[PDB]
UniProtKB/Swiss-Prot annotation:
Keyword Secreted in record: yes
Coiled coil, from the record: none
Name this polypeptide is given: Carboxypeptidase inhibitor
Organism: Rhipicephalus bursa
A single GO BP: acquisition of nutrients from host
Length: 39
């Protein structure tokens, strides 16, 4: 889990925009960052 290593979460296919999606396979359908909450 690439996203879990990097400390990120996992969002649904509707709430994660195409700008916030990560380049990794750290989830089971899509992975999204959490950096918008910190800034």
């Amino acid at each position: 889990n690439e996203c879990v290593s990097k400390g990120f979460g996992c969002l649904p296919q509707s709430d994660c925009p195409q700008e916030a999606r990560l380049s990794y396979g750290g989830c089971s359908t899509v992975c999204c960052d959490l950096s918008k909450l910190t800034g």
